[PDB]
Design a protein around this ligand. Structure first.
Ligand SMILES: *[C@@H]1O[C@H](CO[C@@H]2O[C@@H](C)[C@@H](O)[C@@H](O)[C@@H]2O)[C@@H](O[C@@H]2O[C@H](CO)[C@@H](O[C@@H]3O[C@H](CO[C@H]4O[C@H](CO[C@@H]5O[C@H](CO)[C@@H](O[C@@H]6O[C@H](CO)[C@H](O)[C@H](O)[C@H]6O)[C@H](O)[C@H]5NC(C)=O)[C@@H](O)[C@H](O)[C@@H]4O[C@@H]4O[C@H](CO)[C@@H](O[C@@H]5O[C@H](CO)[C@H](O)[C@H](O)[C@H]5O)[C@H](O)[C@H]4NC(C)=O)[C@@H](O)[C@H](O[C@H]4O[C@H](CO)[C@@H](O)[C@H](O)[C@@H]4O)[C@@H]3O)[C@H](O)[C@H]2NC(C)=O)[C@H](O)[C@H]1NC(C)=O
Ligand SMILES: *[C@@H]1O[C@H](CO[C@@H]2O[C@@H](C)[C@@H](O)[C@@H](O)[C@@H]2O)[C@@H](O[C@@H]2O[C@H](CO)[C@@H](O[C@@H]3O[C@H](CO[C@H]4O[C@H](CO)[C@@H](O)[C@H](O)[C@@H]4O)[C@@H](O)[C@H](O[C@H]4O[C@H](CO)[C@@H](O[C@@H]5O[C@H](CO)[C@@H](O)[C@H](O)[C@H]5NC(C)=O)[C@H](O)[C@@H]4O[C@@H]4O[C@H](CO)[C@@H](O[C@@H]5O[C@H](CO)[C@H](O)[C@H](O)[C@H]5O)[C@H](O)[C@H]4NC(C)=O)[C@@H]3O)[C@H](O)[C@H]2NC(C)=O)[C@H](O)[C@H]1NC(C)=O
Ligand SMILES: *[C@@H]1O[C@H](CO[C@@H]2O[C@@H](C)[C@@H](O)[C@@H](O)[C@@H]2O)[C@@H](O[C@@H]2O[C@H](CO)[C@@H](O[C@@H]3O[C@H](CO[C@H]4O[C@H](CO[C@@H]5O[C@H](CO)[C@@H](O[C@@H]6O[C@H](CO)[C@H](O)[C@H](O)[C@H]6O)[C@H](O)[C@H]5NC(C)=O)[C@@H](O)[C@H](O)[C@@H]4O)[C@@H](O)[C@H](O[C@H]4O[C@H](CO)[C@@H](O)[C@H](O)[C@@H]4O)[C@@H]3O)[C@H](O)[C@H]2NC(C)=O)[C@H](O)[C@H]1NC(C)=O
Ligand SMILES: *[C@@H]1O[C@H](CO)[C@@H](O[C@@H]2O[C@H](CO)[C@@H](O)[C@H](O)[C@H]2NC(C)=O)[C@H](O)[C@H]1NC(C)=O
Ligand SMILES: *[C@@H]1O[C@H](CO)[C@@H](O[C@@H]2O[C@H](CO)[C@@H](O)[C@H](O)[C@H]2NC(C)=O)[C@H](O)[C@H]1NC(C)=O
Ligand SMILES: *[C@@H]1O[C@H](CO)[C@@H](O[C@@H]2O[C@H](CO)[C@@H](O)[C@H](O)[C@H]2NC(C)=O)[C@H](O)[C@H]1NC(C)=O
Ligand SMILES: *[C@@H]1O[C@H](CO)[C@@H](O[C@@H]2O[C@H](CO)[C@@H](O)[C@H](O)[C@H]2NC(C)=O)[C@H](O)[C@H]1NC(C)=O
Ligand SMILES: *[C@@H]1O[C@H](CO)[C@@H](O[C@@H]2O[C@H](CO)[C@@H](O)[C@H](O)[C@H]2NC(C)=O)[C@H](O)[C@H]1NC(C)=O
Ligand SMILES: *[C@@H]1O[C@H](CO[C@@H]2O[C@H](CO)[C@@H](O)[C@H](O)[C@H]2NC(C)=O)[C@@H](O)[C@H](O)[C@H]1NC(C)=O
Ligand SMILES: *[C@@H]1O[C@H](CO[C@@H]2O[C@@H](C)[C@@H](O)[C@@H](O)[C@@H]2O)[C@@H](O)[C@H](O)[C@H]1NC(C)=O
Ligand SMILES: *[C@@H]1O[C@H](CO[C@@H]2O[C@@H](C)[C@@H](O)[C@@H](O)[C@@H]2O)[C@@H](O)[C@H](O)[C@H]1NC(C)=O
Ligand code: NAG
Ligand code: NAG
Ligand code: NAG
Ligand code: NAG
Ligand code: NAG
Ligand code: NAG
Lengths: 134, 109, 430, 143, 129, 134, 51, 51
């Protein structure tokens, strides 16, 4: 369905904004989400991922610790907050849904540790753009 | 892990079959019984669209001439009778583990 | 509201789909039969069948593991009972054959038998044209057919070959579901699914182009296959109205013995007594003609134009094949595939004594001769047909695995998992 | 014994007064006659293909019986049929209401409703109650 | 493409902990004791034949189906010179079953024939009134 | 190595005792029914027959525990009932046998009636008391 | 080396190496000898410290 | 060099059991022996061991 973002634009280094991706119709708490970054004239870079219950969060190594993601399954929103901005972060951000459905976490019997399954993407939002310069 | 591909440029005309392969460093076979390699296409100036999710199955709105195969390390996407609107790029995307990477995107003119 | 508490119920009526290993149940003695294998659990004539109420359960008759399980087992039963017997390795020598329709049975004279080393023994023998091959370098002089093919191994003469019904029982905690729709396609859902613990009788009959002693489809004549408009998926014709056949070996066939193994005697045809009369079969010409029209009506509900044509389908794979009293018949069934639809039928039969396997590579069993005259009668209830793509129908090849798909087409295997939970208002007082 | 597999959960507890339709009784009346010693009246006469399969058949009759007794044995619910616990039901497992589970539902569909969540319930009985009550019982014997 | 940390406990996870911390952990070592070219089958019977023995000995002691239980058999201070709070707060189990290894046979005879045999002839004859 | 005499009545020891006396050795008989002392000291160095005898011994054991489970008497060794005796089995009275006779002889008085006892204990003690649960 | 057809046992085809294409080069292993030369001085770093 | 120099020939009658027949093979070193009292006649090194 409908899948866009908001809050894009252009800021300075050292700044901090937060985007807002909003989904339309599918049950949002059922699915995990992602973030991808296409640099202009380059390929794609994976950014982040959230579990469906907003419990599991995995970041890329380059943007590790700087950014922030979150969910609101009632308001059907999707946030990518960012901190300590650098000029090479200037690219196209895209909000994207997992292709398959995901289940609840698994809890293997032999060790009391849950498991959140993660598979790839089908619906890319057209996405905003953030530029970091002077 | 690392996963690149080849060839970068295939500037062609419609009417012939060809194929694009993506080469894997780490072998992919998850314990579910499937190999998490996802092939899809963007157009220039557009967010991409899913061609095939698995190397076996396809997606809705896909012509039948889009076939893919491969081993745990070799991976191949074949396009029979390459259609006129096959412009833009073709990214090979894997889903083994994190961070899940891509290819460069093979340009087809 | 009431804070709901967890409650464990033991004995819930649930299951899943599963795979397993099965075991026989013979309903009955010296234990020297290849299939019956009276070292087996005896049955129970309890009627155990439990009917359900509200079940919609898809089956399949091709992707069901119960038929692939037999074909890895009935070749194991038939090869355990073949290993301890004598090999026939010194028999592959130079032959010298002559004849006494034409000359079919062959007075052959090979002349070594190494019971010892220094003194090899000349020998008298009687063979068949379905077992010997010519040699191109001299006058008439033969050899067995499968020397350079595989190890020809004699079956021990004190064995048996009769089909005895083998009730597959699932092991305990498992169950076998069974449908009871008369109009069942073979691969759809069902409505009345009954539950048994152990299946019905299965005669382990081996034959080709037909089925013998079969079972009975009821009330009409059923045709099943998977991919109709493909030529590949073989249609299977089950019947009502069990068509009887007589087949016989009208000879006497005394057998002698030849000592080749030191303690292991080789058996061959000593001399025939009487008149050389070819083995054949008899079929009632009336019932056969009445039966085929009943097939075409069901054919014309899946091929309902371009009318149905019968045409007959290498000595082995083309011929009709079956066993009769531990004796294997190859019968020319050309006559039964002549008509289209817009007294006593005699079919000639040939006799081969070197059978082959199911995969037909790597082993070759040799039948011993049987004294006396052989009579056997059986109900023909099963027909194998293949399309070609008006519609013409050949009988088909020899994929023996397809036999039991006509006998397991109501059966799947489940796993009773009687433990499960549900919420309710009642808490255990701690 | 599967006679009410199309019945509803609010009604299948009525006929479950028979001992899960005498569930385990069918095993003992089987293994009295599975242990017909004609197997010992032959020593099977050999080792045969069937006796290989019977041996692999009796083991699964042994093991999968034990895995259902042990789990009933650990849950403070040894040998009973309908026992309650102390574990509170969490609505995150199923947001179905009360009567829809009981009056308006089969069993095998309800398996696929919580076959995901089943394993979490297994740990959340033992470590929540049956590990727990035994210590609190032993404290009540300290006095 | 998965992964989270520990939640409840692990298998043998308390086997370096004290008794007072391992006593709340017994179920994980209780569940997985049973479930887990002939030489798989020879393992699949020994795993059963060890489980029945430990199940059987709990059955004789009037202590079947419970994870823990008490008896009336008196502890004999000749068996242990250890103080009480050292046992329940300092010693692990793996050390503890090297210290009472020799006395174990005396213990098991002095449970059955001592008490739970005797708690049936006393039990059966509390009738008639 | 020396060894003093037994003070705990070893295996089959009270076979000559009366029925009121041999009841003190019931625990020793039950324990050693299963596997005996463990033989086969891990010497797997070099069949089929071996393990059929091992599998039967479990089935002999599991026959009885299930049968005591139906008889409402799992775990115990000595348990009562609600079934009165029928003296047509054997009318031999109380101290005629109890302080007078061993167990081998009491079994040779009741062997003809054995399966007849088992249905009555099944029905009138637990199939009965299933209709008292409510 | 190529395929071949040597005489048959009882249902047992035996094989003995068929022809070379026509010119023989003897088989050899082929190791990057710098790293191997680099390696054994690295070994006596840790071979040493016990005497 | 010492290696594949010798292809050989011998009569054998394995499964036909009627007439022997000479052959041609390809044989390395490390498996043949120049036998005694004969001019250039070979035999496999491990005949009179087990099978
Ligand atoms: C805890 O626990 C414990 C127990 O446990 C234990 O330990 C462990 C560890 C393990 O070991 C186990 O096993 C064990 O069991 C407990 O304790 C206990 O208690 C009890 C009580 O009851 C006790 O008992 C007691 O015992 C005693 C002993 O007995 C023995 O001995 C006797 C004799 O005596 C002796 O005498 C002499 C003479 O006189 C002396 O000498 C002297 O000495 C002095 C000093 O001492 C000086 O030196 C001088 O000079 C000199 O002369 C000595 O000493 C003594 N001894 C003592 C010890 O005392 C007798 O009579 C008896 O019978 C016995 O004997 C023995 O016997 C046996 C048999 O039976 C024998 O053996 C044999 O041998 C041979 C060879 O020779 C062969 O080998 C055979 O086979 C074998 O069998 C031996 O020899 C012997 N010996 C002798 C020495 O003799 C007794 O006596 C006692 O009695 C008394 O008392 C009572 C009380 O009641 C009375 O009644 C009576 O009458 C009398 O009087 C008693 O019985 C025990 O001991 C203990 N133990 C221990 C301590 O250890 C506890 O209790 C617990 N705890 C809780 C809390 O519970
Ligand atoms: C228990 O757990 C298991 C998983 O764990 C398992 O068990 C554990 C114990 C572990 O062992 C673990 O390892 C095990 O795996 C859970 O199983 C999961 O179940 C879900 C179902 O609940 C499965 O999801 C489905 O998967 C398919 C694909 O999966 C296939 O392959 C797998 C394996 O290969 C098979 O198992 C499976 O059966 C399939 O064959 C996926 O495609 C499905 O998604 C489509 O359908 C739903 C339903 O319509 C769509 O959702 C809708 O979306 C719209 C849009 O917003 C909303 O409006 C609707 O409200 C919403 N919902 C409904 C009910 O309609 C979903 O979006 C998607 O829809 C398709 O979307 C595309 C893109 O938009 C669209 O294509 C478009 O087409 C048009 C026209 O052609 C144009 O061309 C467009 O351009 C084009 O994009 C298409 O038409 C849409 N189709 C439809 C019909 O809408 C579905 O999610 C899941 O696979 C399965 N497994 C796993 C691993 O997760 C199980 O659920 C758990 N149990 C419980 C009780 O929770
Ligand atoms: C019925 O089941 C429920 C669900 O069960 C769940 O699923 C089952 C299948 C099984 O796997 C269960 O194990 C599993 O729990 C049970 O619900 C669970 O209840 C427990 C309570 O015991 C919950 O635990 C709490 O977890 C909270 C989250 O911890 C995560 O996050 C921490 C950081 O938090 C993050 O902060 C950032 C700040 O920026 C947030 O970002 C903002 O988000 C906004 C909204 O989107 C906005 O977008 C902003 O832009 C953005 O900045 C971010 O959202 C936020 N994360 C979340 C998830 O909100 C990490 O530090 C931590 O590591 C973990 O990653 C904790 O906050 C919380 O602690 C607080 O609460 C305590 C008690 O309330 C209190 O004492 C503490 O002092 C503290 O204040 C708990 O630890 C668990 O999350 C629940 N599960 C789920 C899925 O939600 C339920 O208990 C059960 N029923 C019963 C009766 O038991
Ligand atoms: C096969 O058997 C025939 C029949 O005995 C052999 O032919 C005979 O050879 C002798 C020797 O000269 C003659 O005296 C006979 O007249 C022949 N009889 C016939 C019918 O031809 C023959 O030698 C045997 N061997 C082969 C290889 O054919
Ligand atoms: C068994 O097959 C026979 C032979 O076809 C069936 O009898 C005929 O069935 C057709 C189709 O219903 C009718 O048109 C004929 O009138 C029937 N009789 C004759 C003499 O041809 C019979 O219905 C099948 N079922 C049973 C239970 O006998
Ligand atoms: C039954 O078999 C026929 C083949 O004779 C199938 O028809 C064609 O199958 C090919 C195989 O991929 C397809 O490419 C064609 O599009 C099919 N043609 C039509 C008109 O469908 C048919 O699909 C098979 N049916 C089933 C259920 O297997
Ligand atoms: C096949 O052989 C059987 C003999 O088993 C024949 O059956 C006999 O048929 C006659 C009729 O001509 C009856 O009077 C006899 O009672 C039958 N006897 C037995 C034992 O069945 C049968 O006729 C033969 N022919 C066919 C075509 O089946
Ligand atoms: C492993 O040992 C350490 C100590 O060596 C245990 O740590 C103690 O844990 C308790 C529980 O909260 C604390 O009260 C103590 O203060 C801890 N000790 C120290 C020195 O801080 C630890 O718990 C043990 N591991 C397990 C699984 O029990
Ligand atoms: C589903 O099958 C049952 C089976 O009933 C049996 O039918 C045979 C027919 O010959 C009869 O001989 C048996 O006596 C019947 N009873 C038993 C207990 O085997 C039918 O009764 C149902 O009507 C069938 N359901 C439908 C929808 O046809
Ligand atoms: C339950 O039975 C339904 C028929 O009645 C319906 O029940 C309530 C719960 C409402 O949904 C209402 O529409 C009807 O009166 C079936 O429709 C349904 O499939 C059944 N099964 C369920 C809910 O799991
Ligand atoms: C097998 O026999 C060998 C003797 O064979 C003869 O001697 C050698 C020197 C060659 O000339 C050979 O060709 C001759 O036929 C022994 O040397 C050898 O040890 C034996 N091998 C065994 C016993 O394993
Ligand atoms: C060899 O015998 C056959 C059989 O009669 C005969 O046809 C053939 O002519 C004989 N060969 C010669 C050379 O006569
Ligand atoms: C049998 O009927 C079902 C519907 O009841 C149908 O889906 C199935 O395809 C049919 N079988 C065949 C072989 O066509
Ligand atoms: C042949 O096809 C026509 C066209 O629908 C149909 O009406 C007719 O019934 C078919 N013939 C038969 C015998 O079914
Ligand atoms: C048991 O007692 C009844 C009377 O209640 C009697 O009829 C019956 O004969 C007795 N049983 C036997 C086996 O004699
Ligand atoms: C072995 O061959 C590969 C392939 O080119 C090469 O990269 C490597 O350096 C070679 N190693 C040697 C020659 O030691
Ligand atoms: C072997 O043969 C060669 C040439 O044929 C000859 O020179 C040599 O003397 C022979 N050796 C013998 C006969 O030992």
């Amino acid at each position: 369905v409908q899948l866009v973002e908001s809050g894009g634009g252009v800021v300075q280094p050292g700044k901090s904004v937060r985007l807002s991706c909003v989904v339309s119709d599918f049950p949002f708490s059922k699915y995990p989400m992602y973030w991808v970054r296409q640099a202009p004239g380059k390929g794609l870079e994976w950014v982040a991922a959230i579990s469906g219950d907003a419990w599991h969060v995995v970041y890329s190594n380059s943007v590790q610790g700087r950014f922030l993601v979150s969910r609101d399954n009632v308001k059907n929103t999707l946030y990518l907050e960012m901190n300590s901005l650098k000029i090479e972060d200037t690219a196209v951000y895209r909000c994207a849904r997992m292709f398959q459905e995901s289940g609840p976490p698994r809890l293997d019997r032999w060790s009391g540790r849950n498991y959140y399954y993660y598979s790839g993407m089908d619906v890319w939002g057209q996405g905003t753009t953030v530029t970091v310069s002077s | 892990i690392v996963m690149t591909q080849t060839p970068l440029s295939l500037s062609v005309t419609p009417g012939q079959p060809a194929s694009i392969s993506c080469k894997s460093s780490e072998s992919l076979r998850q314990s579910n019984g499937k190999t998490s390699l996802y092939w899809y296409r963007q157009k220039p100036g557009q967010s991409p669209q899913l061609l095939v999710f698995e190397v076996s199955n396809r997606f809705s709105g896909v012509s039948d001439r889009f076939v893919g195969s491969g081993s745990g390390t070799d991976f191949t996407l074949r396009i029979s009778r390459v259609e006129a609107e096959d412009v833009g790029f073709y990214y090979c995307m894997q889903s083994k583990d994190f961070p899940l990477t891509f290819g460069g995107g093979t340009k087809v003119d | 509201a009431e804070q709901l508490w967890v409650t464990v119920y033991y004995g819930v009526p649930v299951w899943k789909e599963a795979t397993t290993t099965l075991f026989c149940a013979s309903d009955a003695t010296e234990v020297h039969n290849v299939w019956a294998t009276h070292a087996c659990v005896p049955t129970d004539p309890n009627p155990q069948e439990v009917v359900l109420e509200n079940v919609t359960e898809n089956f399949n008759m091709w992707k069901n593991n119960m038929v692939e399980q037999m074909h890895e087992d009935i070749i194991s039963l038939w090869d355990q009972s073949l290993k301890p017997c004598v090999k026939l390795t010194p028999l592959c020598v130079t032959l010298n054959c002559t004849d006494l329709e034409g000359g079919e049975i062959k007075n052959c004279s090979f002349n070594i038998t190494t019971s010892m080393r220094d003194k090899v023994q000349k020998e008298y023998a009687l063979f068949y044209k379905l077992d010997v091959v010519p040699i191109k370098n001299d006058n008439t002089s033969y050899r067995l057919i499968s020397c350079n093919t595989s190890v020809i191994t004699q079956a021990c003469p004190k064995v048996s070959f009769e089909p005895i019904p083998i009730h597959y029982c699932a092991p305990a905690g498992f169950a076998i579901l069974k449908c009871n729709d008369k109009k069942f396609n073979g691969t759809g859902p069902c409505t009345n699914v009954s539950t048994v613990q152990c299946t019905h009788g299965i005669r382990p009959v081996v034959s080709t182009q037909l089925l013998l002693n079969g079972s009975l489809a009821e009330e009409e004549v059923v045709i099943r296959s998977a991919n109709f408009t493909d030529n590949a998926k073989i249609i299977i014709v089950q019947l009502n109205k069990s068509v009887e056949i007589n087949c016989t070996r009208p000879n006497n066939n005394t057998r002698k013995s030849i000592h080749i193994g030191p303690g292991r005697a080789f058996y061959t045809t000593g001399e025939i007594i009487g008149d050389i009369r070819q083995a054949h079969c008899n079929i009632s010409g009336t019932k056969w003609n009445d039966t085929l029209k009943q097939i075409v009506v069901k054919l014309k509900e899946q091929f309902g134009n371009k009318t149905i044509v019968f045409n007959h389908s290498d000595p082995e794979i083309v011929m009709h094949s079956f066993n009769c009293g531990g004796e294997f018949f190859y019968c020319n069934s050309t006559q039964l595939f002549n008509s289209t639809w817009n007294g006593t039928i005699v079919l000639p039969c040939r006799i081969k004594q070197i059978v082959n396997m199911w995969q037909e590579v790597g082993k070759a069993m040799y039948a011993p001769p049987i004294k006396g005259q052989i009579r056997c009668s059986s109900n023909i209830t099963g027909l194998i047909l293949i399309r070609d793509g008006t519609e013409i129908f050949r009988p088909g090849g020899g994929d023996m695995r397809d036999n039991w798909r006509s006998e397991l087409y109501k059966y799947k295997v489940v796993k009773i998992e009687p433990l499960g939970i549900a919420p309710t208002k009642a808490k255990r007082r701690v | 014994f599967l006679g009410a597999a199309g019945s509803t959960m609010g009604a299948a507890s009525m006929t479950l007064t028979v001992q899960a339709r005498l569930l385990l009784s069918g095993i003992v009346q089987q293994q009295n006659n599975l242990l017909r010693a004609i197997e010992a009246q032959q020593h099977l006469l050999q080792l045969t293909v069937w006796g290989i399969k019977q041996l692999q058949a009796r083991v699964l009759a042994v093991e999968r019986y034990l895995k259902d007794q042990q789990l009933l044995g650990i849950w403070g619910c040894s040998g009973k049929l309908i026992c309650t616990t102390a574990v509170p039901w969490n609505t995150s497992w199923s947001n179905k209401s009360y009567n829809q589970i009981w009056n308006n539902m089969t069993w095998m569909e309800w398996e696929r409703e919580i076959d995901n969540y089943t394993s979490l319930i297994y740990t959340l009985i033992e470590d929540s109650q049956n590990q727990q009550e035994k210590n609190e019982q032993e404290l009540l014997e300290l006095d």
